[PDB]
């Protein structure tokens, strides 16, 4: 499932004077899943069941 | 601006047995902006203005 | 100060069939300082004074 | 193999007011190998075999 709002990612990239390839947002979606999986490991390592912003 | 679908991020975290704090999605959003800023630097370093999935 | 063992980073890169530019290890040193600074924020966020491997 | 100077990493962490767990440097080493593996993928994606600082 896509967790990313493609239009908002493309908008931010455009605001900096860059373009986005057709498959760029797919790559970022993969990185986002990795960031979350890493955060869950940190949450568990601190004996918590609630993910906090500082866990990412 | 939010780059993610909060409901889908919270759902994925719940599917792994975890809850999400009120500001956890905001933390992930901040990390995503940092990942994009890093990617723009990599795009420019390869004499491109089109961001590719491999730049993230 | 350099926190990286340049010879061991270059060795690992060589083992994968790649070469290392003259200024590559400097870039990785900068990323390492960022990783540590992020980890210290996570340590403090969990009311600890001792950095753990899971904080990185 | 360790890619970092443990004494200098522990010193930097101490300078910021923190202690380092016995296996904390091992955790950072693991993250560094991941950063290099990601960089090799970026190098190859730009039709290069020489890793640049901007690939990390």
TrEMBL record, chains A, B, C, D:
It comes from the Bacteria. This is DUF1931 domain-containing protein. It comes from Leptospira perolatii.
């Amino acid at each position: 499932d896509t967790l990313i709002v493609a239009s908002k990612v493309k908008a931010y990239i455009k605001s900096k004077g860059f373009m986005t390839s057709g498959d760029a947002v797919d790559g970022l979606n993969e990185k986002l899943y990795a960031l979350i999986d890493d955060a869950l490991k940190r949450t568990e390592s601190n004996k918590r069941t609630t993910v906090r912003p500082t866990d990412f």
